[PDB]
Amino acid sequence: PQITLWKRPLVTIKIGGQLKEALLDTGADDTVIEEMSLPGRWKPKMIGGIGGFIKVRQYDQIIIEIAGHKAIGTVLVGPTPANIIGRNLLTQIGATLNF
Amino acid sequence: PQITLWKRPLVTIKIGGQLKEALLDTGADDTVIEEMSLPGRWKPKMIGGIGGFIKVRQYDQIIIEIAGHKAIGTVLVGPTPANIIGRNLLTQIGATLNF
């Protein structure tokens, strides 16, 4: 799809067997989701944003489907105010910014 | 241009006669720049993201160039960790997300 930016670019994702709404975020290095369980090991991480830092759990090799498109990568889980799909997974679905 | 996301989408901007680096951010409603002087009156605004909220100064109808494309619009100034070009100005330069 071509998605305009008149409104927030939200899409449906499937992760951990759950459907969620997430923001396609070209200004995010990483993919950050609100609290949920994910299988496998994890390790703690601090990430920054406008606002400062939050502590998250880092899960590697997590499969996600973004608006129809399968990918695999690291997913961070923690107290984010918005679910975001960051560049680590946007690349895998071939997303580009065009102007 | 077409910008892939393997690296941060950093571009040069021109504001107040000076060149700066900024991040194209589809997850940002607004445009937020590090402390600088801008002409005219400002108004108060609070902006939130991962981390919490910060106070910023809102300047309207500021001339800004983004990767060479001319825009005129609202610029927020404050203690952001990074210069961010958000959807208010990405829509002015005709940017879309594509996959």
Partner: peptide, 10 residues
């Protein structure tokens, strides 16, 4: 030094 900028007006 993962940085992640969602942003909205509070």
């Amino acid at each position: 030094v993962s940085f992640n900028x969602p942003q909205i007006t509070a």
